Design a protein around this nucleic acid. Structure first.
Lengths: 36, 142, 198, 81, 138, 137
RNA sequence: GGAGGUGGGCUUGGAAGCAGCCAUCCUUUGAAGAAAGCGUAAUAGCUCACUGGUCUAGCUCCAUGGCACCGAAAAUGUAUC
């Protein structure tokens, strides 16, 4: 879900900056995936 | 939201200011409030939209509003009739037809003021107005 | 909470600018007399900006304050001191910065006209409050004359008996003698309550 | 009963405590009293490498932390849980 | 493991949830119904009691019928057995000092209350009171 | 806060003065329902006072004396028992049937204290029989 | 462990924590809300606020702020030092 501005939703989603742009990956839900 | 009663009308646009009256303000009527960091202009529909946002927010959290009321003041009122020609016309031959009011907003005016029993669920509606408004505001309080 | 200061010889823009920019507050002590005459100081901006928030009262100026006015070098040299009240804090609109600290002397026990809030206390239990009664607290802060010595720290009103449609006027406030209200007629209500919607 | 899982990794601060757990009060000498566990040596890490855990027949699965803790405590709380 | 419910004494168990509320604790129901019939004939009938069953893994479980709830006991001794929706504006009965004393004492002998004195279990049961709509005289 | 911990230490200490026999037991692993059952035998049948308290905090209460011999029994999770002074043992005997029966709870017990001296379970009878401190010595 | 009043009270052909409302109150008191999320035709359960020791050490958020980052796609060929 390529976003201009990610948003952590589930209390187990965590932000990761790699290769330049920040993903937000959520362990529990495979739905709270975001890429800034 | 409208200076509906008789007024001179066709107001000179007038350029926007670099500042407000210089004394650091205090709050007019309620515990928590909001203020404009940067000057500019706000349209009546914009301000009313922010008001909808806030009233409906406390209404939603009736859980904190079902006690009585959660009182709010909005302290800006539309002043200047922003006019505009049609979408296809030769410049000139008169002035626009008045099509929407505007309100000068300086660098320190208090747009919103209120006392919602929860500071948490008041600062929570703080950031929920700059989304629907034109300028950058700030969460202040008494 | 001794505040520290170092003098300045300044007027308006040009110099107070550099004071602020290095971090310093142009402040002024003076006596309740006239022309008005006390030294022209600079508090340290660190000292003042931290102090107003620490009190937690945006009118912290209700409290007599005490100044070391260093004249010399180093962290300080013990010099002329001050017992002055803050009558005015010129807080900047822009973000919350500070511009000016106004200090009037009261060291002598001489009277002053100062600010005291009305913090609401009985709000735990009150008949209208338990009907739900809410209100428009017309007055949150007031000005009281009176000496320098016995100055209160604040007025903690007693709203425990705010009857359903009744109100605490100015007279009902718990004053002290020689702190004559006398500057407002007591017919100004300082709260009420009304049963609006359950 | 069931299995112990001694893991221990010689990188972190090493005190004689976890080596106490390895040599004595757990090994063959203590498997004499806990023989249906097949105690052996594992050489990898889980978390705070001396994180010794014992998993029972329903698995109270009792476990204690690294070198700075007393070995006697690891023994007794893995054996109580 | 160990759970306490508020099932009566004359019948066996709550019929509608009889299956899965307890029957995946591996609990053995039939001989337990017989045993509870025994406990009920031992005790007196027609009073909603609290029961504190404990189950295990070894196909062996036990069942303690200690005592009835003191608050529903209050309701049954007074005459109004209801739990109102507004405990703070709808009060049901008028309890007295001696019914308080008797109810607490008969529960004092039972494991229901760890309180030893009379005033402390009195306050416990008048807490039960003020939870619903009960008005202790004095 | 600090004021809370000082009050907890003082109340534990005042109980330590009016008791005459103390039992210190590991109580980790145990369900709440079992603790309520233990309390019923402990208070209704033996009139005893039980507290689970922090080891650092208990040291300060035993610091008042005479339970200074119970200092090394505060390593790991501690439940204390204070029996009434006019009452001799009984709680100690219960804490044993209650330890032995409840193997799912894995209580490691501990050392009790009478005559001001912590005594071993094998030596409990020998120390109890001899009234004077170091009477055998 | 997140207890027993408790499966609260109500709805309900089914509601115990979770289709859904009142209620936030009882007590054990090691914990505990009339269980947060998920669901289970109700269940149960988790884990959740809420746990004892061990950890062995400088940790965490408040802003004064400074320079970074992301949003930021055109036409023949880099083509905005």
């Amino acid at each position: 879900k390529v976003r201009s501005s990610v948003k952590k939703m589930c209390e187990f989603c965590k932000t990761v900056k790699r290769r330049g742009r920040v993903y937000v990956i959520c362990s529990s839900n495979p739905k709270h995936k975001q890429r800034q | 939201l409208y200076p509906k009663r008789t007024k001179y009308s066709k107001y000179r646009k007038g350029r926007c200011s670099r500042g407000c009256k210089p004394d650091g303000t205090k709050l007019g009527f309620g515990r928590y409030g909001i203020k404009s960091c940067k000057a500019g202009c706000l349209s009546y529909r914009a301000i009313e939209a922010a008001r909808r946002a806030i009233i409906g927010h406390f209404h939603r959290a009736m859980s904190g509003q079902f006690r009585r009321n959660g009182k709010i003041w909005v302290r800006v009122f539309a002043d200047l009739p922003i006019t505009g020609k049609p979408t296809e016309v030769r410049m000139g031959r008169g002035k626009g037809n008045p099509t929407g009011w505007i309100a000068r907003v300086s660098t320190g005016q208090i747009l919103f003021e209120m006392d919602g029993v929860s500071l948490a669920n008041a600062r929570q509606a703080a950031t929920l107005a700059a989304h629907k408004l034109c300028l950058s505001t700030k969460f202040v309080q008494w | 909470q001794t505040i520290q200061a170092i003098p300045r010889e300044a007027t308006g823009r040009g110099v107070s600018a550099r004071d602020r920019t290095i971090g310093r507050i142009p402040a002024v002590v003076f006596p309740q007399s006239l022309v008005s005459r006390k030294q022209l100081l600079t508090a340290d901006k660190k000292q003042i900006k931290s102090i107003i928030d620490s009190v937690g009262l945006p009118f912290f100026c209700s409290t007599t304050f005490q100044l070391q006015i260093r004249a010399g070098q180093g962290s300080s040299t013990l010099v002329e001191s001050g017992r002055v009240l803050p009558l005015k804090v010129h807080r900047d609109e822009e973000t919350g910065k500070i511009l000016n600290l106004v200090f009037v002397w009261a060291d002598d026990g001489e009277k002053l006209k100062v600010d005291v809030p009305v913090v609401f206390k009985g709000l735990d239990h009150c008949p209208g409050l338990q009907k739900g009664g809410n209100l428009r607290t017309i007055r949150s802060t007031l000005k009281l004359l009176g000496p320098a010595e016995h100055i209160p720290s604040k007025i903690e009103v007693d709203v425990s008996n705010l009857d359903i449609e009744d109100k605490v006027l100015l007279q009902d406030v718990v004053f002290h003698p020689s702190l004559k209200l006398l500057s407002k007629n007591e017919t100004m209500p300082v709260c009420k309550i009304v049963a609006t919607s359950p | 009963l069931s299995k112990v899982r001694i893991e221990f990794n010689t990188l972190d601060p090493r005190l004689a405590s976890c080596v106490e757990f390895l040599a004595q009060c757990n090994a063959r000498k203590a498997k004499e009293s806990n023989p249906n566990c097949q105690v052996l040596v594992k050489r990898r890490t889980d978390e705070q490498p001396p994180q010794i855990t014992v998993t029972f027949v329903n698995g109270v699965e009792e476990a204690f932390d690294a070198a700075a803790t007393s070995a006697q405590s690891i023994r007794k709380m893995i054996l109580d849980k | 493991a160990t759970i306490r419910l508020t099932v009566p004494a004359g019948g066996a168990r709550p019929a509608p949830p009889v299956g899965p509320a307890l029957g995946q604790y591996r609990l053995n129901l039939m001989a337990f119904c017989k045993d509870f019939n025994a406990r009920t004939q031992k005790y007196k009938p027609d009073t909603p009691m609290a029961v504190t069953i404990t189950a295990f893994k070894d196909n062996s479980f036990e069942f303690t019928v200690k005592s009835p709830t003191v608050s529903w006991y209050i309701k049954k001794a007074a005459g109004v057995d209801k739990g109102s929706t507004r405990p703070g504006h709808l009060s049901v009965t008028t309890l007295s000092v001696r019914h308080v004393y008797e109810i607490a004492k008969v529960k004092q002998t039972d494991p229901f209350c760890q309180y030893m004195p009379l005033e402390s279990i009195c306050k416990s049961i008048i807490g039960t009171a003020n939870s619903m709509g009960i008005k202790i005289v004095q | 806060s600090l004021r809370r911990a000082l009050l907890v230490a003082g109340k534990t200490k005042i109980n330590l003065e009016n008791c005459h026999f103390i039992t210190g037991i590991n109580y980790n692993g145990l369900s709440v329902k079992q603790l309520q059952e233990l309390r019923g035998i402990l208070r209704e049948n033996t009139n005893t006072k039980l507290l689970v308290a922090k080891n650092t905090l208990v040291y300060k209460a035993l610091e008042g004396t005479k339970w200074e011999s119970l200092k090394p029994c505060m390593k790991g999770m501690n439940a204390w028992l204070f029996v009434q002074s006019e009452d001799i043992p009984a709680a100690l005997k219960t804490f044993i049937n209650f330890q032995k029966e409840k193997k799912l709870y894995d209580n490691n017990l501990g050392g009790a204290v009478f005559e001001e001296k912590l005594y071993a379970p094998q030596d409990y009878k020998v120390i109890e029989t001899m009234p004077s401190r170091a009477d055998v010595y």
